[PDB]
Design an enzyme around this catalytic site. Sequence first.
Site, short mmCIF file in Angstrom:
data_model
loop_
_atom_site.label_atom_id
_atom_site.label_comp_id
_atom_site.label_asym_id
_atom_site.label_seq_id
_atom_site.Cartn_x
_atom_site.Cartn_y
_atom_site.Cartn_z
N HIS B 57 0.83 -1.20 0.00
CA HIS B 57 0.00 0.00 0.00
C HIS B 57 0.88 1.27 0.00
CE1 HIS B 57 0.45 -0.44 4.47
NE2 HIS B 57 0.81 0.79 4.21
N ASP B 102 -0.66 -7.92 1.15
CA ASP B 102 0.10 -6.69 1.33
C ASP B 102 1.61 -6.78 1.50
OD1 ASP B 102 -0.17 -4.07 1.32
OD2 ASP B 102 -0.75 -3.75 3.39
N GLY B 193 3.64 5.88 9.37
CA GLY B 193 5.05 5.89 9.08
C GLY B 193 5.69 4.57 9.47
N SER B 195 4.42 1.61 8.49
CA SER B 195 4.00 0.75 7.39
C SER B 195 5.16 0.08 6.67
CB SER B 195 3.06 1.50 6.44
OG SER B 195 1.70 1.55 6.88
N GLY B 196 5.13 -1.18 6.33
CA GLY B 196 6.13 -2.01 5.62
C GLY B 196 7.28 -2.43 6.52
#
Lengths: 56, 245
Positions: B57, B102, B193, B195-196
């Site tokens: 995303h 994801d 922030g 994310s991943g």
Amino acid sequence: DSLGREAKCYNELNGCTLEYRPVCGTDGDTYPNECVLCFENRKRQTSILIQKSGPC
Amino acid sequence: CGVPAIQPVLSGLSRIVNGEEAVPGSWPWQVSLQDKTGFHFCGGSLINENWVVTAAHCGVTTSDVVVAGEFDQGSSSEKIQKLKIAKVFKNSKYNSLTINNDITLLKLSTAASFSQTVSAVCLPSASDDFAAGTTCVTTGWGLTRYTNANTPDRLQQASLPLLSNTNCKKYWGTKIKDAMICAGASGVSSCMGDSGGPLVCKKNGAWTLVGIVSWGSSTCSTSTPGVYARVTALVNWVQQTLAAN
């Protein structure tokens, strides 16, 4: 009177993605991401647009 | 794989209202995804000297930069690696409506130079089972308070326990899929922030990648579980993309 761009949620999810992509709302406020601006408008029953991307 | 030269020091503050600051260099696989402008918008973990794994995303472009070895982003300067990206591998099954499947693989142009402060995370086996109630670590530069709207300069780390699909569905109900794994709801939350980034569960001495930061509470609610991409469910795809590239 003015404006530009409506913030989008993931309606099929009732939480957000955790990326940092600040948006400047037409209110003068920074939103960590767009989904935030959307949930804030939902809750607040407000209609704040995105002025410019990135911080105010 | 999964052994920082530099040893993490996880204190009781790592378990309460949005964790603590990391010992610099203690999570070597931790990278930051940045703009051309040098602006951090997602994290990632190094699995190789060549590849980075992240959430899909995030919208990583070939124009974006992978920064290895950073602690303090507000450093006038430190010893980091600004690696370029050459090819982006976004999971075909990623569902944009649902944030299911994801994971995205970033193949580097410039190999990362494994140092003491830059190394890789161990990826799990599909058949791997990380029990609910296992305390894990999540690292990043995500906000510390939703209310900050300023991402921290220094890497943070939180300790949170794993949750059963079953007891996460109590909070997210039907949104929780099989390529998802829940963690937290304990005094600590993943936030904008993060994310991943990684959700590491130590296994047989190594720190192993069990989740990727995905989504969660729109307000970084410490009493709500945070959702991650479930690595065991997506690792054969990692394995196979790596093989063909």
